Design a protein around this ligand. Structure first.
Ligand SMILES: C=C(c1ccccc1)[C@@]12CC[C@H](O)[C@@H]1CC(CCCCCC)=C2c1ccccc1
Lengths: 237, 11
């Protein structure tokens, strides 16, 4: 059985084929416009890929239950606190669902060999990607499913780390009720895995660590002149 | 962050 609250969360999920198709098409046109001598560095492609993923994340949040009740200033503070976490969580779940050994599945629907990516990404992003893959392997061994994924999305979005909120009580209530719903759901659907609920929660600090370190690296690359938008606005704020 | 506000306010 599924707690009704989780059903309401599932109702808010985007149509993932449409999201990926739109991003794939955007990036195709971008490269098409570019002359022979001005193509995008692979790092630059990933930045634009992440940029366009952020647009869909904002659109998802603004239409979601609970979030749509917040005033816009509260909505901005939540997304500014968790945008990078949501990008990483989405990346991780994509590998859990579609990931094969030795390759990375991108939001465009492209499968890319890790040996290609690791050649171009540099030590820092390779480290963060490898740590993310460790979470992928752990989540796949626990049978991380879509109901749990949407719970973690909402726990990331409605973070107690966000200060200066006009309606902090709603954020606290969502955090608490989604927690109780996840606890119940894992207990009913995976009774044998006593460790599952805790192993899910303990990924959130790790995703937080990975995403904040990812933010700091990208801010470095921006300051260094390496980044081309929404991604930059989120970094600064 | 005018861009984020716009994405949250736009029709
Ligand atoms: C936060 C990222 C990022 C942003 C800018 C530049 C590079 C990466 C992501 C997260 C998902 C996005 O598709 C991005 C794609 C990616 C995986 C493969 C691209 C590597 C660079 C050649 C991201 C990622 C995933 C896990 C850990 C760190 C970054």
């Amino acid at each position: 059985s599924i707690p009704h609250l989780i059903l309401e969360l599932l109702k808010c999920e985007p149509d993932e084929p449409q999201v990926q198709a739109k991003i794939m098409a955007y990036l195709q046109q971008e490269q098409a416009n570019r002359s022979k001598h001005e193509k995008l560095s692979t790092f630059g492609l990933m930045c634009k890929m992440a940029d366009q993923t952020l647009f869909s994340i904002v659109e998802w949040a603004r239409s979601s239950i609970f979030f749509r009740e917040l005033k816009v200033d509260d909505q901005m503070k939540l997304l500014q606190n968790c945008w990078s976490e949501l990008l990483i969580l989405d990346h991780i779940y994509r590998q859990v669902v579609h990931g094969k050994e030795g390759s990375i599945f991108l939001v465009t629907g492209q499968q890319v060999d890790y040996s290609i990516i690791a050649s171009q990404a540099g030590a820092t992003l390779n480290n963060l990607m490898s740590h993310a893959q460790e979470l992928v392997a752990k989540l796949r061994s626990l049978q991380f499913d879509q109901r749990e994924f949407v719970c973690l999305k909402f726990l990331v979005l409605f973070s107690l780390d966000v200060k200066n909120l006009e309606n902090f009580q709603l954020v606290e209530g969502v955090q608490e009720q989604v927690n109780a719903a996840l606890l119940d759901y894992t207990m009913c659907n995976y009774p044998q895995q006593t460790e599952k609920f805790g192993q899910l929660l303990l990924r959130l600090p790790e995703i937080r660590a990975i995403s904040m370190q990812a933010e700091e690296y990208l801010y470095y690359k921006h300051l260094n002149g390496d980044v081309p938008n929404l991604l930059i606005e989120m970094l600064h704020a | 962050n005018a861009l984020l506000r716009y994405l949250l306010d736009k029709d």
